[PDB]
Design a protein around this ligand. Structure first.
Ligand code: 12Q
Length: 108
């Protein structure tokens, strides 16, 4: 029951990471790569951090997992212009993400 959710989330998270539009979100944004990012974005999130949280048994509900992944997308859309490559990847990956949640039948 805790293990089933874990399996499902791990599978979903791994598929998101393997996706060709995930590259911007793989790791914490680097300061050398992004002007005053950490002054603008107060709740940073990335897929590496999500993998640890998953490993650390943080994701006890669907809701917590969704909030973190959704935050990856909303941070990107707050920081970046709408026709930036980064914004485009976020929306592509978000579509993919929601497809995978629905395929898994995942609910709270
Ligand atoms: C996700 N993201 C941003 O949202 C903004 C800058 C940036 C730079 C390098 C890598 C990822 C980045």
């Amino acid at each position: 029951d805790p293990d089933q959710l874990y399996s499902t989330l791990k599978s979903i998270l791994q598929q998101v990471k393997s996706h060709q539009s995930a590259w911007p979100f793989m790791e914490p944004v680097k300061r050398t790569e992004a002007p005053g990012y950490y002054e603008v974005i107060r709740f940073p999130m990335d897929l590496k951090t999500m993998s640890e949280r998953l490993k650390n048994r943080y994701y006890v509900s669907k809701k917590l997992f969704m909030a973190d992944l959704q935050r990856v997308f909303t941070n990107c859309k707050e920081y970046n212009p709408p026709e930036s490559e980064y914004y485009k990847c976020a929306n592509i990956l978000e579509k993919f993400f929601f497809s995978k949640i629905k395929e898994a039948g995942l609910i709270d």
